[PDB]
Amino acid sequence: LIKLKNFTELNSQEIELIFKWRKTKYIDFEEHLRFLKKLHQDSSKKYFLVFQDEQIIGVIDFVNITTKSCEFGLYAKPNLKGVGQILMNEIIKYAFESLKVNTLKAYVFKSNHKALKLYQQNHFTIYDEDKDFYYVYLKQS
């Protein structure tokens, strides 16, 4: 039902679509392609387009991937609501089962209450804070 499409396999329609989330100019298109090219070359980052029954519902990402940890991010398709939990399920499953990391980490601006609540609901704990960010983690064991 829920499937992950690696950014390394995106087609031009998908690239067009997702980078507009908030007449494509050549410089924007070219900058998106250069990003996708870096993803082909960098095993420490992985971005996925997430599908639910052949409909796009958001993007998830894992960066600073090591054998023990990673950072993650998520972004709901902007016309959809209530898909954060699905994206979070996928993030945790993929990190624990596919990357096999013990620690999942993120940081978010303190004003991002939607994201914080979602992380807290999935048993994340705030372990640090600076002027801009809260830093959260979840450990498998």
Ligand X SMILES: CC(=O)SCCNC(=O)CCNC(=O)[C@H](O)C(C)(C)COP(=O)(O)OP(=O)(O)OC[C@H]1O[C@@H](n2cnc3c(N)ncnc32)[C@H](O)[C@@H]1OP(=O)(O)O
- Kindly state the number of chain residues that form the binding site for ligand X, as judged by CB under 6 A: 18
Give the DSSP H or E segment for 72.
strand 69-76
Where do the H-state alpha helices sit in 20-131? 26-41, 84-93, 113-121
73 binds ligand X (CB under 6 A): yes
75 binds ligand X (CB under 6 A): yes
136 binds ligand X (CB under 6 A): no
Whole-angstrom distance, CA of residue 65 vs CA of residue 61: 10
Instruction: Provide, rounded to whole angstroms, the least separation between the CB of residue 26 and ligand X.
Output: 25
Between 38 and 113, name the residue whose CB sits nearer to ligand X: 113
Token pair for 103? 């620690």
Contacts of 52 (CB under 8 A, 6+ apart): 1, 2, 83, 86
Question: How long, in residues, is the chain?
Answer: 141
Query: Left if phi > 0, otherwise alpha if psi is -120 to 50, otherwise beta: which for 67?
Result: alpha
91 binds ligand X (CB under 6 A): no
89 binds ligand X (CB under 6 A): no
**Per-residue contact flags (x/-) with ligand X for residues 16 to 55, judged by CB under 6 A:** ----------------------------------------
Instruction: Provide, rounded to whole angstroms, the least separation between the CB of residue 133 and ligand X.
Output: 10
The residues of the shown chain that bind ligand X, judged by CB under 6 A, are 73-76, 81-85, 87, 108, 112-115, 117-118, 121
